[PDB]
A paper describes a structure:
The RGD (Arg-Gly-Asp)-binding integrins αvβ6 and αvβ8 are clinically validated cancer and fibrosis targets of considerable therapeutic importance. The highly homologous integrins αvβ6 and αvβ8 bind to latent transforming growth factor-β1 and β3 (L-TGF-β1 and L-TGF-β3) leading to release of active TGF-β1 and -β31–3. Here, we describe a method for computationally designing hyperstable RGD-containing miniproteins that are highly selective for a single RGD integrin heterodimer and conformational state, and use this strategy to design inhibitors of αvβ6 and αvβ8 with high selectivity. We found small α/β ferredoxin folds were able to scaffold the RGDLXX(L/I) binding loop without clashing with the integrin while making additional contacts with both α and β subunit (α- and β-loop respectively).
Residue numbers in the entry:
A (entry chain C): 3 to 74
B (entry chain B): 113 to 354
C (entry chain A): 1 to 440
Write the structure that this text describes.
């Protein structure tokens, strides 16, 4: 599965940074890549587990962040 | 041995948090390399963020005090443009100032860079541009900018006059009164002030500023890289004149 | 060529109120008298606890020439909870935009802030008041659970407004979704029939609206300015809306279907930061029974005789043809930094020659930046590039904002019932509004 976190506005860098640090702590063995020159953060190589936690954590703590989840 | 006056203008918005460490390196590297062009070398410094006006900035008192509030993160309050260092021969002072710059913040993606360019180029009496020297203005940012008419959303409908308005705190006192300047106005004054404008931006943002450079005579662009010397190369080649 | 500019009816408001910021005509039902509607967004008013809340005044044409506030709202700020204000009307700029359809008056406050029910926030959602006959209700299409920058929290709904022929209100909210912008269209009957004074968020079931998209469209300002007309031959007025920062500051204008809000056409500017889409208008200018599209780009820089770029402003005109194709021509401004094309207003058939005519303003032109308004005629071939009449501002500049004569204007209404539509031109920098009659 893939979770794409899209950050917007001037604070996008600070929000992404905060989320990215959180993700490293929650899933240090995940493939976490910075895309769109720092405006989007993508997590892949996950299996419908973290999707119930990290996607929700970001929406709850950072309501303004847009999240898209895809699974195969 | 023709004199050169370099003004370094730094973007301090939240979006610069990823860039700032390399900007500080460019600043000090520049100061060291500029010494190789002429003995009559001076350099100054200033900074900008955004107009501190709704909807560009939230007006709740907690966020006004700290515009990075609820991230959580601490940063400086939103301001338009500030002039910090009249260009000087004191290269060491320049480096000390640049090294101590801190992050500020606003809400929207574009910044108040055009207000900062106008004041830095126009306020000759406070910046110290020489009568007989090159006038180089280095603009550092990682984003696009607001321009005249965009301020209508904030309730600002009084056109930029192109005049110097720096108070005793070296702050742009008309930041929340006048509209962002237009490009036609920036060109008019950059030409009158004989200032060469350099746009140092990140990759995604380069093409857009290249298009602006094609409108603004004497303007050049470059990529903000860790190998920042690629920008200094523009400054160095600009020194040949002839 | 037939405006009486020698003895116009000049109206004034309280100093600093920006009287004349926005204008329209009021035409009440039956053989009633005609009135002028003049906004004054910084008027102090008599609203308890409110400073510079803004108001709209009804000015009498028939005689006397006095203006009186319209009592849309005569109260202070409502509370959410003890010592916790729900709304902030101070400096909301009510009256910054005013429109009227028959006896219905729609006025809005683009800088109105509201406290989200959820938390003690303060967001510029925007609000409108619609007076229908003797009943006035609050309309707030961007006041909902869709909060914050990603939602409608920064909508500023009411920034731009119009009416459709088929009894609907068209509202732009340029700040929606991180400034992508949103268009909203609602039925007038629905707005009033669903109104309750103790309900802050009302869902309108027959509402049409645009939706949020990818971040690539952020900072575009859709809904910055709006206009209406039939662009597909369905008999239903469609929606024309400017998008001034689209395409990386190149600027775009969109046309959406009047029935299901589906995109039909797109226009694009030619120059970066010309602010193409600043203002739009729609009218049949060549008498071909198809609405034509008028798009301003006030910051456009042309190429002078010396090769130097200079800011004059530009207006593009796209003629609608029966085949669905458009024929586009362009008109440039006449003075540097006058910002020609800042305001465009159809005049209807000003001279009764069978073709609609149109005015284009240049608010910062003329001596002392008093402001200039240009009058152009229509013809079977399109718009006549050369103006037939020029209106000069008559007021000395003051500190802050210049008189800006021509900043905003509205015509196509025959106020004196002489067979020719008249024109109201604002000059808010001097708190003034001026009525120009059309001569036979
Ligand atoms: C005028 O310019 C407008 C802006 O470019 C044009 O509107 C856009 O046109 C593109 C191309 O047709 C549309 O893209 C489609 O997207 C859907 C998927 O939509 C869903 O998923 C996305 C996330 O990926 C989500 O954001 C949406 O809300 C949906 O949930 C694809 O399946 C299509 O193949 C295609 O890629 C844009 O959606 C559309 N709107 C916007 C705002 O971009 C408009 O068509 C132009 N009009 C004219 C006459 O030229
Ligand atoms: C509105 O009233 C306040 C308080 O008296 C005053 O400070 C402000 O200048 C007035 N605004 C006007 C006349 O526009
Ligand atoms: C909108 O209505 C037209 C005309 O009935 C139709 O052709 C078009 O497909 C409709 N579009 C949508 C999204 O409903
Ligand atoms: Ca239609
Ligand atoms: Ca036509
Ligand atoms: Ca005519
Ligand atoms: Ca008349
Ligand atoms: Mn920024
Ligand atoms: Mn950055
Ligand atoms: Mn910004």
């Amino acid at each position: 599965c893939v979770v794409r976190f899209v950050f917007r506005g001037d604070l996008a860098e600070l929000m992404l940074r905060a989320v990215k640090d959180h993700l490293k702590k929650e899933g240090p063995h995940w493939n976490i890549t910075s895309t769109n020159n720092g405006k989007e953060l993508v997590v892949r190589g996950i299996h419908e587990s973290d999707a119930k936690r990290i996607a929700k954590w970001v929406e709850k703590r950072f309501p303004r962040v847009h999240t898209e989840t895809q699974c195969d | 041995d023709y004199p050169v006056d370099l003004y370094y203008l730094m973007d301090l918005s939240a979006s610069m948090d990823d860039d700032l460490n390399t900007i500080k390196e460019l600043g000090s590297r520049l100061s060291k390399e500029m010494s190789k062009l002429t003995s009559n070398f001076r350099l100054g410094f200033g900074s900008f963020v955004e107009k501190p006006v709704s909807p560009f900035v939230k007006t709740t008192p907690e966020e006004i005090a700290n515009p990075c509030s609820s991230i959580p993160y601490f940063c400086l309050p939103t301001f338009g443009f500030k002039h910090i260092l009249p260009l000087t021969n004191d290269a060491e002072r320049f480096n000390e100032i640049v090294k101590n710059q801190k992050i500020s913040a606003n809400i929207d993606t574009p910044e108040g860079g055009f207000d900062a360019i106008m004041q830095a180029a126009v306020c000759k009496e406070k910046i110290g541009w020489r009568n007989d020297s090159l006038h180089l203005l280095v603009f550092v940012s990682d984003a696009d900018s607001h321009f005249g008419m965009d301020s209508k959303l904030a309730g600002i409908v009084c056109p930029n006059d192109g005049l110097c308005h720096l108070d005793s705190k070296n702050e742009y006192s008309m930041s929340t009164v006048l509209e962002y300047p237009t490009i036609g106005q920036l060109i008019d004054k950059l030409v009158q002030n004989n200032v060469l404008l350099i746009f140092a931006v990140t990759q995604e943002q380069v093409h857009l500023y290249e298009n602006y450079a094609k409108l603004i005579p004497g303007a050049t662009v470059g990529l903000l890289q860790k190998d920042s010397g690629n920008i200094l190369q523009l400054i160095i080649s600009a020194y040949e004149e002839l | 060529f037939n405006l009486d500019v020698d003895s116009p009816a000049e109206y004034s408001g309280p100093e600093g109120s920006y009287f004349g910021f926005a204008v329209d005509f009021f035409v009440p039902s039956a053989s009633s008298r005609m009135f002028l509607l003049v906004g004054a967004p910084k008027a102090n008013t008599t609203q308890p606890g409110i400073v510079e809340g803004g108001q709209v005044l009804k000015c009498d044409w028939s005689s006397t020439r006095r203006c009186q506030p319209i009592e849309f709202d005569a109260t202070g700020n409502r509370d959410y909870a003890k010592d916790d204000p729900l709304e902030f009307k101070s400096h909301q700029w009510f009256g910054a935009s005013v429109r009227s359809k028959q006896d219905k008056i729609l006025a809005c406050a683009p800088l109105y802030h509201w406290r989200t029910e959820m938390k003690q926030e303060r967001e510029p959602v925007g609000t409108c008041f619609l007076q229908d006959g003797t009943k006035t209700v609050e309309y707030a299409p961007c006041r909902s659970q869709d909060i914050d920058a990603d939602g409608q929290g920064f909508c500023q709904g009411g920034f731009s407004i119009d009416f459709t022929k088929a009894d609907r209100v068209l509202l732009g909210g340029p700040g929606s979704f991180y400034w992508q912008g949103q268009l909203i269209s609602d039925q007038v009957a629905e707005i009033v029939s669903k109104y309750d004074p103790n309900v802050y968020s009302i869902k309108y079931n027959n509402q049409l609206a645009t939706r949020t998209a990818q971040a690539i469209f952020d900072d575009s300002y859709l809904g910055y300015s709006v206009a209406v007309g039939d662009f597909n031959g369905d008999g239903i007025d469609d929606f024309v809306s400017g998008v001034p920062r689209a395409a990386r500051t190149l600027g775009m204008v969109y046309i959406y279907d009047g029935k299901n809000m589906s995109s039909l056409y797109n226009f694009t500017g030619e120059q970066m930061a010309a602010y193409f889409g600043f203002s739009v208008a729609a009218t049949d200018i060549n008498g071909d029974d198809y609405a034509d599209v008028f798009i301003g780009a006030p910051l456009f820089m042309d190429r002078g005789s010396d090769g130097k770029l200079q800011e004059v402003g530009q207006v593009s005109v796209s003629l609608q043809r029966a085949s669905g194709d458009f024929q586009t021509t362009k008109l440039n401004g006449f003075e540097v930094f006058a910002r020609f094309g800042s305001a465009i207003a159809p005049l209807g058939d000003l001279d009764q020659d069978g073709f609609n005519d149109i005015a284009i303003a240049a608010p910062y032109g003329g001596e002392d930046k008093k402001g200039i308004v240009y009058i152009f005629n229509g013809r079977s071939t399109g718009l006549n590039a050369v103006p037939s009449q020029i209106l000069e501002g008559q007021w000395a500049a003051r500190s802050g904002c210049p008189p800006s004569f021509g900043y905003s204007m509205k015509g196509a209404t025959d106020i004196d019932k002489n067979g020719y539509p008249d024109l109201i031109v604002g000059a808010f920098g001097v708190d003034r509004a001026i009525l120009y009659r059309a001569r036979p």
